[PDB]
Amino acid sequence: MFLIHFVHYKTILQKYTFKFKHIFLSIDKYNSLFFNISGILIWLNIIHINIILIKYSFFILINNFEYLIILIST
């Protein structure tokens, strides 16, 4: 049988834990060629992208290493 109704005197507090993205750090340190570009024309067989900034005279570099890449005035 049950005689008494008793509660425990020690009160516990639930620790609220949560994972938030509070820090925003990134290691931006690469080894690559970066160009001044007055025009870039990316021709792969699916998608062609033509981006043109105007000038009086241009030059042409062409890269066929992965996909056709045409650069105007380097």
Binding site: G39, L41, N50, Y56, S57, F59, I60, I70, I72
Partner: protein, 48 residues
């Protein structure tokens, strides 16, 4: 036209720096490379 395997039709030169001039390209020549004939039903154009 239709191509055959092993048979190519030779075409004359334009005598302007080859197909891609290594010395440079003027503004009016690059204007035609700019507005190249893409099919306009699947093309987005944008200028700022």
């Amino acid at each position: 036209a239709r191509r055959k395997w092993g048979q190519k039709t030779w075409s004359p030169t334009a005598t302007n720096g080859g197909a891609a001039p290594a010395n440079g390209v003027s503004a009016q020549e690059a204007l035609q490379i700019a507005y190249r004939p893409m099919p306009p039903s699947q093309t987005v154009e944008y200028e700022e």
